[PDB]
DNA sequence: CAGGATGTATATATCTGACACGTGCCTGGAGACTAGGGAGTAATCCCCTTGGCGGTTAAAACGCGGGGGACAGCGCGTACGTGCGTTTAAGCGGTGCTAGAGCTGTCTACGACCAATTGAGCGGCCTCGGCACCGGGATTCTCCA
DNA sequence: TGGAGAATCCCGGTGCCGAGGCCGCTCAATTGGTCGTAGACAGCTCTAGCACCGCTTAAACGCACGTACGCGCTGTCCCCCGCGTTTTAACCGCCAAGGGGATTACTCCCTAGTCTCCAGGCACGTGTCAGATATATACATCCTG
């Protein structure tokens, strides 16, 4: 139940950053689901990127290549 | 001499559906589809070989690119065809 | 003698190897890469053409037109998400009706 | 006891600042839980999950902006899950 | 006399199982020549060039109209209005 | 008036193929502007695609490449 | 007697030519293409850093922070159009409120 | 004992040329380097495929100019085109 | 629910243009053999990851009033839906012409490539100043009696 | 609405650790010469893209009438927010164990390259038949009763 470790005010803080004032009480399971499916969409691609290199540790370089696959590229770790 | 992959998918259609034909517009769409998949897979294998500082593209990068840019069961059956073809080819 | 017959495929191994050489993807290319790419194009072409033939079969037609390819692509949720950013000419759209538009009390 | 202006203060505070919002170790172990599903006994760089956290919550706050726009379009101020599947299907997932 | 809302729903199916081009070819051709004259003068166009230009145009049009339809549904309405178009082009990221 | 060459029943037909039932009166020139900016974004790439080739006739091939550049690749016209 | 001196650019020309050569983009690389690419990269770097330093000036710090870079590229319209699909780490978002959200 | 190439000093010289009093952090330095690397890869890949589209085996300055006109929005694109063109004639006028 | 009114699905006649199939030929793929360099494999080591202990406290969990927003219901007035007469421009066919794509021949200037040379560029190191942080006072700022 | 209290801005002081310059080596950038071929230029061909005219015909446009639906208003209740109290798991700091990423060295075999040959794939021509067009008929809904 470590998906629940992303906790009750964490979605609240992310929504306050996103500019949302009032949020529902049933919103948390849904955004936990979308964060979970985003994480298995990215982490799997990072895992095959690691697996191709005959490596058993995941760096940040293949993480940002997996981000580059989905059109969600990240600046600050590709150096 | 216009270069195309028409008759190859004609034999594929005959061995998968031996009692039908295909139109010329659907021929253009099938040729463009297989060309888009070729460009996507070869570009992913190219940058995958570049990422590991390797100058050679072999079946490993093609297999990993297939596992990358195809969805799950489609990619699983794609590698199930690919390694079976490479074992049939390397045995003769 | 033909490498496609040696690999037991219909797609040309030598042509894929040629466009891998002149497609400047790398400085050198291996031997199993063109047969692997030919097998992948084999399987993907067979999978789209099988559902296209089924979409022609239940439409009682012995000819494949782009509407059958569009019906084949969007019905199954695998190749549709494979090529979701692709539009097909003479293709149309799947018949989908949102449930709030139908009249009730009929 | 102000009725509803604490939330606007939180909005201004969190859009003004730029620290990491999701708490560190539960995310760092949730990455381990998802990564166990593909290959077992996986080692992880610290900078890998450091990049993954800023990857995840940037997507999350872009999504929350999108469902905020959907909830405003629905003549409401409270977001429901229906705005979430609005945002996901309309933006293309 | 038909009830308003059911013959349009009837020809929904007629245009939705169909596959030909909705917009007439000549006004789209003239419009394409007008908007392409401003980038470079006295251009020429192939016949399949303006045919491929119309294909993506109506494909993007009905992909946007799916989006505006189910965005106007969410606001407990049936009629599509220009702010659903703003919502579609905003969530898609085409505007901002 | 040539932007108005594509017309009220054509827009209503294209929206009807998109599955709508009722259409407001302010829809039509709004989607006329949407079609105008879409053709701007495509034709601006296509015109320099012909301009690089020492060419002054737009073919169907470079339109396909421009639509591939905007992430909306189109089948049935070669490529 | 470097090539970047005669090109008038502080960006490297030989490094760009080296990355263009063994980057397998094409088998032949022209002479003016690396200096053109280095000029465009110089301009884009200057365009980023000008508004980054300006945002640092309004924030009254003399160090460029990733928040300053995010405020530089998101407040400028074609810069956001070029950088729409990227995310900037430790950069945050623009402070904006919808007009219906304010009370009264 | 390793070697890692980056564009830190070049964008340092650009920064001190445009702002002779402002410093930069190391995280922002890496953001800067990754940004210029990404846009370099974008322009180089578009010029490569655009040369392949015209069956040309050489990437000249015209391919870079056309790829700049494709990947950049309008007045930014022609300002970058002007900077690249004046750099090419400056390099060609010199030996 | 029950009977007309239409639009849609089903069944022949046929007919035509696109599609399946045969033919030459020539260029691109296959057979064979060599060179060498890029990948495979093994030993080292040292950074970096993993695991654990323990104090600290900020943050999460929980509970409860209450108020304001989601939602249901109702009234309305107008703005699009649908139908009909009429105009109008799209579509199709024909001609006719020429600008401009496409390809072939040359050669020359531009780019690959290798040897010799060297200085910009990168790792290590050190220093100090910009900036994060704590604390007290002034400044808004929002709710109410 | 003045003001009580709470959050925020601001200035002064402190201490810290990472920007930023210096130094030494080194390997990648520069220069010079060669030589090979990619494409710039001219010219020929020929083809498809405008350009215009006439018929015809179904699509578009304007208008009349209606009705249903989007929007405004009111009531309700419920559920999420603000805040006080309790608990618990994250954070900081520190310490070892060792794991495998990275580096260097030595081999080997696999693929680029070259020459020769031949047959698979493509342009083109031509029957031919399956979808298009037309006509007739059943039927499955909707509209009003």
Numbering used by the authors:
A (entry chain B), F (entry chain F): 25 to 103
B (entry chain D): 31 to 122
C (entry chain C): 16 to 121
D (entry chain A): 42 to 134
E (entry chain E): 41 to 136
G (entry chain G): 16 to 119
H (entry chain H): 29 to 123
Provide passages from the article that reported this PDB entry.
S.c INO80 is a multi-subunit complex consisting of 15 subunits that are divided into three different modules. The catalytic module with the Ino80 (ATPase) RecA lobes and insert, Arp5, Ies6, Ies2, Rvb1 and Rvb2, constitutes the core unit of INO80 (C-module). INO80 slides nucleosomes with 40 bp of flanking DNA ~100-fold slower than nucleosomes with 80 bp of flanking DNA, displaying a switch like response to flanking DNA length.
To assess whether the nucleotide state affected the location of the Arp8 module, we determined structures of S.c INO80 on 0/80 and 0/40 nucleosomes in the presence of a non-hydrolysable ATP analog (ADP/BeFx). The overall structure of INO80 bound to 0/80 nucleosomes in the presence of ADP/BeFx is similar to the previously published structure in the apo state. The Arp8 module is resolved as a well-defined density on the flanking DNA (~40 bp). For X.l nucleosomes, no difference is observed between the previously published structure in the apo state and the structure determined here in the presence of ADP/BeFx, suggesting that the nucleotide state does not influence the Arp8 module’s conformation on X.l nucleosomes. In contrast, on 0/80 nucleosomes, where the Arp8 module engages the flanking DNA, this location of the Arp8 module potentially represents a sliding-competent state of INO80. The interaction of the Arp8 module and HSA with flanking DNA seen on X.l 0/80 nucleosomes is consistent with prior studies implicating the HSA in nucleosome sliding.
